[PDB]
């Protein structure tokens, strides 16, 4: 069984079915980032159609889901146990979803934490940071700094419609 971990993020099941393995596994031995990056590579090791011909056609048997390897770990350089997540995606055929797992993952570094709080406007200003009504506010001046007002703003909206809404 285990005595698992999920460091900041935590993505439930939701392929986090998997994630949670590495959310203790990468996490433990603290290869989070190391592996996060394994994944980054993987990303494009994905991005060709050919890697994952089972992905292309599952109609290739689990031969190819053991030659997966040679789309990925046989094929690999880096593969400590990012080869293992292969071996799961393999049986558990989910390779086409894997990005989302990766996505999910990254949480490591501080970005394994973060969030844009938003009322209005551009508020696509991201945060990775870990302390708030603190960093936020400070950031809120970095952001105030320069300029910054886009998306489509306070004008319609909360602020603008709102009075209308009282009518």
């Amino acid at each position: 069984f285990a005595k698992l971990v999920r460091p900041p993020v935590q993505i439930y099941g939701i392929e986090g079915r998997y994630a949670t393995a590495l959310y203790s596994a990468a996490s433990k031995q603290n290869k989070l980032e190391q592996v996060e990056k394994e994944l980054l590579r993987v990303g494009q090791i994905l991005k060709e159609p050919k890697m994952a011909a089972s992905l292309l056609n599952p109609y290739v048997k689990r031969s190819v889901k053991v030659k997966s390897l040679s789309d990925m770990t046989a094929k690999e350089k880096f593969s400590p146990l990012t080869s293992n997540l292969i071996n799961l995606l393999a049986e558990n055929g989910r390779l086409t979803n894997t990005p989302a797992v990766i996505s999910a993952f990254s949480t490591m570094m501080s970005v394994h934490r973060g969030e844009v709080p938003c009322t209005v406007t551009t508020a696509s200003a991201l945060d990775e940071t870990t302390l708030t009504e603190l960093k936020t506010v400070l950031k809120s001046f970095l952001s105030k700094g320069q300029v910054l007002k886009l998306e489509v703003k306070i004008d319609p909206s909360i602020m603008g419609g709102m009075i209308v809404r009282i009518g």
Partner: protein
């Protein structure tokens, strides 16, 4: 019979005033809703008070 005459006039003025109120309102608001990029600083005061939220919430 005395009431019947009066309350009609009141009611008409009341409903009439609301049908002015709404009609002016949407027309004024639908005309003038433009100067937000001209005065940015309605979002600068958002960021001002919002900094006095981002500080002064906790």
């Amino acid at each position: 019979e005395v009431k019947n005459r009066l309350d009609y006039h009141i009611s008409v003025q009341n409903m009439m005033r609301q049908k002015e109120q709404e009609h002016m309102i949407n027309w004024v608001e639908k005309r003038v809703v433009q100067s937000i990029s001209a005065q940015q600083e309605k979002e600068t005061i958002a960021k001002c008070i919002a900094d006095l939220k981002l500080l002064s919430k906790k």
